[PDB]
Amino acid sequence: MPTLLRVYIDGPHGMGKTTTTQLLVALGSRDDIVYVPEPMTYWRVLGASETIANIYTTQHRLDQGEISAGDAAVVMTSAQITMGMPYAVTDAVLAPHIGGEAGSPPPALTLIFDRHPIAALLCYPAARYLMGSMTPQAVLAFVALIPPTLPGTNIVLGALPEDRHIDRLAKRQRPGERLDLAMLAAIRRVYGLLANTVRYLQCGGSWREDWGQLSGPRPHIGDTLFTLFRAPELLAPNGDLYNVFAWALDVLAKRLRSMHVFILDYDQSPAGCRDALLQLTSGMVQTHVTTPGSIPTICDLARTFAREMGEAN
Amino acid sequence: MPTLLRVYIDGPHGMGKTTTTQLLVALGSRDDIVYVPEPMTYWRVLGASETIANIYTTQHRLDQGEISAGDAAVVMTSAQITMGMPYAVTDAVLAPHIGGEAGSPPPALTLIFDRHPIAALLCYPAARYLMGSMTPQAVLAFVALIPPTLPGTNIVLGALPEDRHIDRLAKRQRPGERLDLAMLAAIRRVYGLLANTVRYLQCGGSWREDWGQLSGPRPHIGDTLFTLFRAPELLAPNGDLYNVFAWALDVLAKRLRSMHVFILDYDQSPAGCRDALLQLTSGMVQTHVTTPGSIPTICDLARTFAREMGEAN
Ligand SMILES: Nc1ncnc2c1ncn2[C@@H]1O[C@H](COP(=O)(O)OP(=O)(O)O)[C@@H](O)[C@H]1O
Numbered sequence A, B: 001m002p003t004l005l006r007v008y009i010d011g012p013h014g015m016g017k018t019t020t021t022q023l024l025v026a027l028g029s030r031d032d033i034v035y036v037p038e039p040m041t042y043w044r045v046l047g048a049s050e051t052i053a054n055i056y057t058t059q060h061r062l063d064q065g066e067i068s069a070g071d072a073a074v075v076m077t078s079a080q081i082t083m084g085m086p087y088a089v090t091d092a093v094l095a096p097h098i099g100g101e102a103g104s105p106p107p108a109l110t111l112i113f114d115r116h117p118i119a120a121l122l123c124y125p126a127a128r129y130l131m132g133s134m135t136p137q138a139v140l141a142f143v144a145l146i147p148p149t150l151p152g153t154n155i156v157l158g159a160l161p162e163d164r165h166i167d168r169l170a171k172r173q174r175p176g177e178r179l180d181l182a183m184l185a186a187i188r189r190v191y192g193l194l195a196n197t198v199r200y201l202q203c204g205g206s207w208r209e210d211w212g213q214l215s216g217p218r219p220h221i222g223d224t225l226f227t228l229f230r231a232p233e234l235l236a237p238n239g240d241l242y243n244v245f246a247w248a249l250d251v252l253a254k255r256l257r258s259m260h261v262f263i264l265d266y267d268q269s270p271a272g273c274r275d276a277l278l279q280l281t282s283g284m285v286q287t288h289v290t291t292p293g294s295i296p297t298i299c300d301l302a303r304t305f306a307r308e309m310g311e312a313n
């Protein structure tokens, strides 16, 4: 039985995610390692035009008081649906080939993904929500749509001090981006809350029993994503969340619970970061594929994605 | 082992769906039959304000040339996310309790749902796409997000001549609706294409082998939803769909394939329609629940939904 290893490099933008994985795959590691790049072409052309631009422009006009939060929210929402679509469809076709977890044993194939579905379906929307360009109900709608967590979902979140992050953020500006530190802070905070949420849950956390603590390495509820959703728009007159919104948080918990997060330190040289990623790989969960044909089908799948939707990896 | 029966009454609006199910549950059928109503309160208040109004107004202004197709599309998209959210979250929490199909045997509990997730995630968006207020890429994004089809998903689509439909459409106008026959035709056509798509697939249909037939009771490809997606925005220079868009159609097929559709004729009296629905029930697939506690948890779930998000069933 062959094994597949799936790694999702994620975290806030402009940290060294692209720089470090492209070096990772640049070790001449046969054909057993494949890199699935950010689908910039989908975002800029295929799905709609200059979406990244659309987003950064829209937050700007909002900040300059040129549009209402309502108008911002509508645009931001449709924008995000577009951002994550490539994520969703890939995961959707990759589902029927992922079998149970085979412990931590030569992975016949290794997929290094650039971002996991939660990035566009949960992480960014939540930041926009913090930036005032997204409604909490809009966020929970994406949450309710997050696909079931597949076995062996290894997510590598990054770590890098604010100052060094800003510098690197400056050097690399995606086509249509605008330097927005407020967003840099929101995105950073959301990702921190996420990692904590996983831990909190994996240590027996139950958002329902701890909800009262809000209503006033062993992270408490207050240090998790759940705090964001204690907004007035979501609270019934009796002070409890409405059942729809509670169930969404339930689904949030079910999805996050079974994810394996690792924290790659980026505060170092491209070589080092590459080595560290590689070092982490040793301890990541592998899984068996459902059919003998899965590996080639999967190998080719990634290749097709990368070819058709990557700008330059 | 207890069994659950799940029925999804769907089809275009203003056909008698509410009128006929409320009579169905009105036979004094103990506590074994539960009706999950349209979540109007979520649409009108909880999720955002007067969404149904937002939609009908937005299509109107578009038609009057007061907004661009682009502006229409953005609004329409976020609107729809909001429309289906209650659908998505319910299905999401109902997932872990649905086990395999137990043939067609007294269903311990029977849930009569008002619309299935595909209504807001596929059916309506596709109509708006036809109305020019939604982009095909927007539609396929919702498609890629349709949750895995659960066992025993029984979907009852309705049948009623255009003339009789229009009349009934007039008598019942949801808060904020606008009589739009163009939409009535688009919605009707989409739902027809859907039923055909199921059949087509269940008779060994493969959209990939039949794609060429487009590129020019045994329904051919041309009579299915697949025809809608042969749009220029989705076609590569070489005449084939781009791989992202193809995979989405793949996911469309995987989702539709395992659904059980039935066609309830509405061209009759409320009593008759009720009897016919009841008659169909006999031949619908049941499934076992995953835990002994599932039934009560599920029974209560439906009750909570109905209570908190139904206007008057
Ligand atoms: N280890 C590193 N040390 C210093 N600068 C780096 C390092 N890795 C990447 N960079 C630079 O910082 C910017 C952001 O990195 P990049 O990998 O391109 O972003 P992202 O995290 O968004 O994928 C780029 O200009 C890149 O050259």
Ligand SMILES: Nc1ncnc2c1ncn2[C@@H]1O[C@H](COP(=O)(O)OP(=O)(O)O)[C@@H](O)[C@H]1O
Pocket: B012, B013, B014, B015, B016, B017, B018, B019, B020, B167, B168, B169, B171, B172, B266, B268, B269, B270, B273
């Ligand atoms: N069997 C029927 N014959 C004639 N009119 C009907 C019948 N069932 C419902 N109606 C009427 O047609 C309108 C639409 O029906 P309704 O069930 O309310 O809509 P929907 O299909 O959208 O749920 C209502 O005014 C209703 O009174």
Ligand SMILES: Cc1cn([C@H]2C[C@H](O)[C@@H](CO)O2)c(=O)[nH]c1=O
Pocket: A013, A038, A052, A055, A080, A083, A084, A115, A119, A120, A121, A124, A125, A174, A177
């Ligand atoms: C994944 C994702 C990225 N982005 C932005 C962050 C970066 O500028 C760029 C991804 O590199 O797009 C979003 O705005 N939303 C998203 O969902």
Ligand SMILES: Cc1cn([C@H]2C[C@H](O)[C@@H](CO)O2)c(=O)[nH]c1=O
Pocket: B013, B038, B052, B055, B080, B083, B084, B115, B119, B120, B121, B124, B125, B174, B177
């Ligand atoms: C389910 C759904 C209904 N509708 C409209 C049709 C009806 O006017 C009303 C549902 O009864 O809302 C949409 O516009 N989009 C949807 O996704």
